[PDB]
Design a protein around this ligand. Structure first.
Ligand SMILES: *[C@@H]1O[C@H](CO)[C@@H](O)[C@H](O)[C@H]1NC(C)=O
Lengths: 39, 50
């Protein structure tokens, strides 16, 4: 059971929110590419 | 809200249909400064402060 969230202490000024469908021996391989081009 | 404590809502990440507001008969004042209502429905803006 997931019952511990400790990643932040505050959230003051939000500009953008987006809720989506979930993306997800070692059995799974997950590749991601993150790019910042022209905003 | 009261005018001293006027509410500000930031509008982002959506499609703003201005023709619905402009063609309404329920508004007494729709005075636009700096832009015309006809081309509002075409242009795009970063954020809208309401
Ligand atoms: C950001 O947050 C602080 C405190 O929460 C506030 O004083 C400031 O006006 C905010 N700035 C914007 C641009 O929302």
């Amino acid at each position: 059971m997931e019952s511990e969230f400790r990643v932040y202490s505050s959230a003051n000024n939000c500009t953008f929110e987006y809720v989506s469908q979930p993306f997800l021996n070692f059995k799974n391989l997950r590749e991601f590419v993150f790019k910042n081009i022209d905003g | 809200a009261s005018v001293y404590a006027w509410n500000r809502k930031r509008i982002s990440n959506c499609v703003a249909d201005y023709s619905v507001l402009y063609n309404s008969a329920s508004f007494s004042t729709f005075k636009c400064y700096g832009v015309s209502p006809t081309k509002l429905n075409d242009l795009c803006f970063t954020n809208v402060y309401a």
